[PDB]
Design a protein around this ligand. Sequence first.
Ligand SMILES: [Cl-]
Length: 138
Amino acid sequence: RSSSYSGEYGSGGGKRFSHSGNQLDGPITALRVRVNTYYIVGLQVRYGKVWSDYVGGRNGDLEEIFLHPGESVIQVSGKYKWYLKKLVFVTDKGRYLSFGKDSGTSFNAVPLHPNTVLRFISGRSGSLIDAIGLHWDV
Ligand SMILES: [Cl-]
């Protein structure tokens, strides 16, 4: 069994979401994160050439980062309070894809099993991102 799960990081408000179906579209190839003065407001993840359904709220500015072909996320750190505040996606090409404000309770997620990478995310959302979980696999 190579799959593992890190989380859930954050709190209990909002509604649950999961990108479990999306990994069939492809590897993660891009990230959209909506950010405001204090929080991570929303998330979208591109699986192959297909963006996930948008989750979270509308009160923030959209930031977008494309991963290079064949680049994988191998660690995710972040910060929260009652809501998510910071995410850093660490890649196997040595990049640190950072979003949000450097404040709050710290977390540091790494995969349990050998040569696994981030395959999808889940969490909770409303008008903000309440919580996040990371799903690792081959
Ligand atoms: Cl699309």
